[PDB]
């Protein structure tokens, strides 16, 4: 397979149909699937790693949205990523203004 | 009478609890029910737009995720 | 010996909860009301996917919750702990929602 | 009866699962949690290939080549998260042109 | 004179100046005033054929029709710029389509 | 041989427009509807902004529209204004406006 | 006696003008050698056509006047009529621009 | 050289007297230099890479215009 040739997980394939049949250009070059798929898994594996360490961290196997939302926002670059993206039932980070405690 | 009073007081005071918020005047439940009355009149407004173009008389998620992507506000989780 | 709070302090505790949490913080009827009533000014006898409905209410709240900690800073900036609706209205001035 | 309806409503989660096993054997993920993973991927397929296609377009080239997708990755990408990503691509490409 | 013709370079402005002297004929435009009005065509240009373009690829078909630009332009612009450009639109067509 | 233009009763090029759709990656195929409901949206709106833009300039005593009259035209009509909202229109200036509180008693 | 405007008065003579006007407020030069040294950073012996230097300018400028309008508004929230760091830092934060 | 300087403490009063500011604080100056030149690195980097993905070796103004499409900040009248 394409995706096992190249050391991925992620279908080498499938992106290099979606890109034809994604009214992106009239061709698309070969090397282009295989790059843009280790770029998606490359992403994919960081936020599950972060979102997988805190599902650790509240003693689930399993993560969920919750766990995702506190990955992505903790993390500065993925935050900025996905700035204008509102994760379902993902909540906020706790933060209450400094002026708002007591003394 | 209306369902925009069916969006309470206490309910709103919820929402601005989990945004940050210790203290609120009474005036901004009426305030808060107005923006979110447009909020919802411009994301179903879209929605709805892509159900007309569907030939469909049923708003599905996906019209929905569309409609809140246009508005700027990309919306995970429901078939994105 | 009745027991009280002073003003602020359940408000500060309520705030810790909410943070943590991440359920639906409106209540799912009146909302669902509230959508299909607004649906109808644009098209009658509109069906609703549950799905659907629940999108609109995970991106309501979000949005909602989202300008209240940006009006929270304007009530602070303005030397208050109260937010009122000018803190809202500047906010959304300044976010490009209104003129 | 059978009753022949598999719609086949195609996802990224089969790999999302291949992943993530790689980097932590022993957790699983929620349904709704596969669901903004899956979201997420569509997302950000839609940004670099809508970033090439512009590229393409504008220079004049019918062709979306690993180029292409690089130079998008790198204006869409905050400044760590490209070099990683950069990496992964260009060793990817690199390694696929070696096999077969 | 001088040798090699300067490479074309398409524009809108021929057009301007003609729906200029409909509305105010006794009005000309300046040299960078031209240049906004073409970015301006452009811009909606690519927004409405983008949106028809995704509209298209969202009910899965690969035809773009006069109905799709009415859909977008319908998201696109505001209430009564939208309802005369609707008006404008479907005017042509139907025009354009008994003069066949 | 007469234009597509002229069947549809407009100045903006439907040829042109028709050709940019195939050559633009918007879909695969092109209804011949299409270009020529685009082309006359864009028309509309141009004559729109021309219509603004024009008076604008007669208001200022001049004949020939230039940036400042497109953008006065265009910030002074709310539908246009949230059309163009993320737009910049270069040599435009903005419309004078002094907080009333900044104002002398 | 020697003529005195009081502190205010030529402010708002100098906010009518500007905003009459549409030319550039930062003279160019300057501006074009901040351009050229900026983009060092990421490549060197970079040409410009000229067109370049005027778009990155009036898209400059453009932004900050907006800015400052939003900081004036800031300002005005908090009872004040002087613009101040915090006011342009709390404009930018709700516009998203900074975290 | 060290053209920063060169945005001078006037040329900043009237951007901010266009953008309607009556009084200014003493701090302003070094502060709006800070956010321009945090507008300018953002916006020339992207342009600097298209022009590179051109391989050309000068920024054109369309490098700049696409680059301003690319930050929301779309601009009008350079080939736009
Ligand atoms: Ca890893």
């Known amino acids: ?103 | 009478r209306d369902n925009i009073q069916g969006i309470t007081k206490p309910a709103i005071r919820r929402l601005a609890r989990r945004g940050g918020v210790k203290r609120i005047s009474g005036l901004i439940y009426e305030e808060t029910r107005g923006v979110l009355k447009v909020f919802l009149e411009n994301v179903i407004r879209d929605a709805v737009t892509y159900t007309e173009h569907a030939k469909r008389k049923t708003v599905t998620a996906m019209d929905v995720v569309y409609a809140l992507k246009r508005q700027g506000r990309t919306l995970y989780g429901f078939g994105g | ?99 | ?100």
Not at chain 4, 73 to 78: G, I, K
Request: with cysteine; hydrophobic share 40%.
């Open chain 4, 1 to 100: 009866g059978k009753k022949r309806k598999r719609s086949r409503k195609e996802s990224y989660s089969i790999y999302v699962y291949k992943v993530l096993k790689q980097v932590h054997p022993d957790t699983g993920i929620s349904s709704k949690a596969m669901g903004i993973m899956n979201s997420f991927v569509n997302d950000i397929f839609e940004r670099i290939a809508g970033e090439a296609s512009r590229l393409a377009h504008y220079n004049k080239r019918s062709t979306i080549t690993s180029r292409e997708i690089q130079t998008a990755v790198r204006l869409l990408l905050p400044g760590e998260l490209a070099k990683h990503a950069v990496s992964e691509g260009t060793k990817a490409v690199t390694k696929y042109t070696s096999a077969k």
């Open chain 3, 1 to 99: 010996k009745p027991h009280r709070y002073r003003p602020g302090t359940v408000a500060l505790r309520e705030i810790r909860r909410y943070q943590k949490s991440t359920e639906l913080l409106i209540r799912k009827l009146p909302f669902q009301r509230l959508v299909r009533e607004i649906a109808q000014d644009f098209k009658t006898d509109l069906r609703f996917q549950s799905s659907a409905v629940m999108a609109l209410q995970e991106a309501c709240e979000a949005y909602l919750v989202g300008l209240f900690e940006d009006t929270n800073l304007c009530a602070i900036h303005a030397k208050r702990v109260t937010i009122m609706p000018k803190d809202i209205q500047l906010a959304r001035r300044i976010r490009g929602e209104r003129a």
């Open chain 1, 1 to 103: 397979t394409r995706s096992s040739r190249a050391g991925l997980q992620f279908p080498v394939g499938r992106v290099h149909r979606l890109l034809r049949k994604g009214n992106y250009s009239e061709r698309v070059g070969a090397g282009a699937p295989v790059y843009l798929a280790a770029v998606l898994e490359y992403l994919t594996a960081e936020i599950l790693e972060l979102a997988g360490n805190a599902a650790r961290d509240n003693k689930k196997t399993r993560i969920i949205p919750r766990h995702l939302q506190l990955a992505i926002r903790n993390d500065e670059e993925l935050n900025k990523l996905l700035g204008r993206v509102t994760i379902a039932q993902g909540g906020v980070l706790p933060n209450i203004q400094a002026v708002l405690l007591p003394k």
